[PDB]
Symmetry: D2
């Protein structure tokens, strides 16, 4: 026997919980420090968390976890090299951190140690950028840059205390504004290289690599992108994708132009129904039984009809599917023979699974069993969603495959077209208006997306409810109320979200609205500010406009000049109060709108997320305009 | 709305089992998949059951070959054969 | 069957010669070509067939029919430029509701031929808001200082606490033109806005994203309201002669 | 991408035209519409152009 044992998210032994990985305390302290930064003290905590007790043991734990996840191990020589680099960094950081804590230390000595540490980090960084092993080192790299980006940050805050002149502080601000972009570019380079390479052989391997990066890489990139401020909230909304089925090669231009769009579906709607096209046949005698998954159809909004079949919903060749007012549910043909008795069955049915009473599935059990027969691969399938057994295999017992993650819930169920070209309808597959479907004879795969629990409230109330206790709120762009036409979904995982909106409408206007509600006890007199993250490659003469619409009490909050820049930019509005907007605890049609005029042919612009933070809690510490 | 119906498609009498002179009067075909004598066996019955769903009445389509051998006393003495007609929109259905 | 569209022979009959059937009307042009489902029940997907978002189709084995719609020539400019161009010489402008730039979801088409149009918009959205926008452009020589007024024809059977709102949106220069109390009345009503000028709206001869918006809040289950058409007339040329409130 | 192909499906030799002893070796079927001897004629060729 090869393996009769159960599986856990396709792995032979249970995986570590997403909140119990080795980089979790680092991320937690980073999120804590983003809200309130303890000057000349945060670098010490980051050093104690990355190198506990001046030991590289936590980094080795991270390396082992990543190697276990992505099925790529390193050689002992590379391990020794990385450990030597760790030891050098640890020596220099020990010198610096020890000299800091002496009451009455010399500022010039601290300046020298700071310069030595920054130089050593910059010098040893390229050791983690060898592409031949990047798929692993991209994790370790992510930590090192952090240790650097923290250091410089602290150096900018503690000015003359560490022996820095004003020119030194300005040079450090310039170096920080340069490195916060260079490190992100290099990280994205490694990620895109390895992701495309792994997708060109099988979509499952690329999905696994992406799931690893969503936990060990991208949250820290977002943290970097939020370190220049003080008061915003560090929150990730990336999803984990479980793939069960055969291997399908996918190009990188085909991932962001079709496959990801088919996986996401209605990006702001809750899954309400899922349908499968099941086929079973044991026609001959020497040829064993077999099963096929012909198509998957997810139904989110029952009144929109945007999502279509991924695969096919056909059940016969008699062109009878919607006639007589009913829907064909199952077609079974039983054949009997006679030789001087073994009835054969051919079944083609449509399995339907509606959403549970609690609106969402918590876990699943989906598995496929392969069988070789004269260089021909036959399949058997087992499907169970939550507590409803959807399909038990007729070809024999199949071991389970527990698909679950503590702190996540099932939000989307889709598939990938198998045996067809994935290069068509790229420019047609938009967010709305168009039909989201793709014809294919079979799929033979099921893809389940788990979303974190911080998104469970939006997909249940269709709005964003504000509380008084919290100080900062992050709103992803994909969690909108309505969006304009000719809008696309752009996978931007470095933003710690499931994607961004690409506006490319050449008529009327490009507008995106978000629904806001207020809980009881909310203080309507407290001052707030809005921060909008956008990317405007082409110049827009009318700029970007942030507006508040409340039952006709439309008020203009901000008008920002849209200049050409290929990098992400944050627009900050002036202060305001919820009494100026006319919003109370009973307002149900309150909306925030981000709008711009029509574009030209070949032009587009990107919207990432929104930040709502109180005025007292928000402060810019490192100016971005000083390059 | 269209009621049930039955059809007699062919009759095949077999006298001398080793001569093979008599053939089908009508047709012995049971499907359009060209499968009748493959795999060494003879197709005896093909049943298709269709299920629908409207916000349950399974339909059946049966095509089989009924076989009756000669009795122990070599000959049949009597029989009971009958057909029932039914009109439906100028269409005659049979049982 | 014999089919010919304009000058392109689409299908000549193989079963023999068929006499012609000249489909033409002086002053009209072909705008829509459709058919009717034959041999199937026509009672399904009524609540699903909306103006947008949904798929506009119906499965049927055959149709055996072709239906051609001729529209008058006064609509030829809109279906060619996707906007309404305003001139200085004319004093009054009528804009049907179906000639919009964009419309909200859960909106239906209501055949109201007594309004001398091809139909009216029925809003029945129970979330966000019900909004309808119309694109306006100005020809050269248009006087931007002349005063104008807006008249909105609506039918509001159920009470709307927030009422109806007419607004002018021009590249962010959004200005509120009118806020009208929506009381329950099963008959058609005209709301007249206050006077305004195109300089107050910031619209010139080069504005390409100028829009007029008619909006209202979300409705309740089983509620809807109808919009028929819009009237743009100069202030000097408009006068109410028979008061409608004196019943 | 799949090149052209040809198949020999059946051979039928006819010796004595009035005996009918020899039959098809293979198959004489040409379609799945069960039309071969209807209308008094014999189906000679079925061509489908796509």
């Amino acid at each position: 026997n090869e393996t009769d044992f159960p599986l856990y998210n396709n792995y032979t032994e249970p995986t570590i919980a997403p909140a119990l990985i080795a980089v979790a305390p680092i991320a937690q302290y980073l999120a804590t420090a983003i809200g309130k930064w303890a000057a000349k003290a945060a670098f010490s905590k980051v050093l104690s968390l990355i190198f506990p007790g001046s030991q590289p043991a936590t980094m080795e734990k991270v390396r082992t976890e990543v190697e276990t996840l992505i099925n790529q191990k390193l050689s002992q020589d590379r391990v020794n090299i990385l450990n030597a680099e760790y030891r050098g960094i640890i020596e220099v950081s020990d010198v610096f951190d020890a000299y800091i804590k002496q009451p009455g230390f010399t500022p010039a000595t601290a300046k020298g140690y700071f310069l030595n540490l920054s130089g050593a980090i910059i010098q040893r960084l390229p050791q983690f950028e060898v592409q031949t092993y990047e798929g692993v080192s991209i994790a370790l790299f992510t930590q090192m840059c952090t240790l650097h980006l923290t250091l410089l940050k602290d150096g900018i805050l503690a000015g003359s205390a560490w022996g820095f002149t004003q020119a030194d502080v300005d040079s450090f601000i310039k170096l920080f504004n340069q490195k916060v972009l260079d490190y992100r570019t290099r990280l994205m380079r490694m990620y895109t290289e390895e992701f495309g390479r792994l997708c060109k052989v099988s979509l499952k391997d690329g999905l696994t690599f992406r799931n690893m990066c969503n936990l060990y890489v991208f949250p820290f990139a977002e943290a970097w992108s939020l370190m220049r401020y003080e008061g915003l909230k560090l929150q990730s909304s990336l999803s984990l994708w479980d793939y069960v089925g055969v291997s399908i090669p996918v190009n990188y231009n085909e991932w962001g132009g079709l496959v990801y769009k088919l996986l996401m579906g209605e990006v702001n709607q809750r899954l309400t129904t899922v349908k499968f096209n099941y086929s079973f046949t044991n026609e001959p005698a020497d040829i064993p039984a077999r099963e096929n998954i012909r198509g998957v159809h997810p139904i989110y909004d029952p009144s929109s009809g945007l999502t279509g079949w991924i695969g096919n919903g056909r059940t016969n060749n008699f062109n009878f599917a919607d006639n007589n007012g009913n829907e064909i549910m199952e077609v079974r043909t039983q054949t009997f023979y006679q030789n001087p008795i073994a009835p054969r069955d051919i079944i083609n049915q449509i399995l339907t699974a509606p959403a549970p009473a609690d609106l969402f599935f918590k876990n699943a059990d989906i598995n496929v069993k392969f069988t070789q027969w004269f260089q021909s691969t036959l399949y058997g399938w087992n499907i169970k969603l939550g507590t409803q057994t959807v399909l038990s295999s007729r070809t024999g017992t199949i071991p389970p495959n527990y698909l679950a993650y503590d702190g996540y819930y099932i939000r989307a169920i889709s598939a990938c077209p198998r045996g067809v070209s994935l290069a068509y309808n790229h420019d047609l597959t938009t967010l709305t208006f168009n039909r989201i479907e793709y014809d294919s004879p079979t799929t033979e795969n099921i893809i389940v997306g788990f979303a974190p629990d911080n998104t469970k409230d939006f997909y249940s109330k269709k709005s964003h409810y504000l509380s008084e206790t919290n100080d900062s709120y992050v709103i992803p762009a994909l969690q909108f109320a309505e969006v304009s036409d000719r809008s696309f979904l752009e996978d931007t995982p470095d933003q710690a979200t499931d994607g961004s909106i690409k506006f490319a409408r050449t008529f009327i206007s490009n507008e995106a609205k978000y629904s806001i509600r207020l809980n009881t006890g909310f203080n309507t007199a407290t001052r707030y500010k809005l921060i909008i993250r956008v990317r405007v490659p082409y110049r827009l003469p009318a700029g970007i406009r942030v507006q508040s619409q409340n039952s006709g009490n439309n008020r203009m909050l901000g008008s920002f000049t849209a200049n050409a820049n290929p990098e992400w930019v944050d627009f900050v509005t002036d202060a305001f109060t919820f009494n100026d907007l006319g919003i109370t605890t009973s307002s149900t049609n309150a909306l925030f709108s981000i709008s711009s005029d029509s574009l030209n042919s070949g032009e587009e612009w990107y919207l990432s997320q929104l930040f709502l933070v109180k005025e007292s809690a928000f402060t810019t510490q490192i100016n971005p305009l000083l390059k």
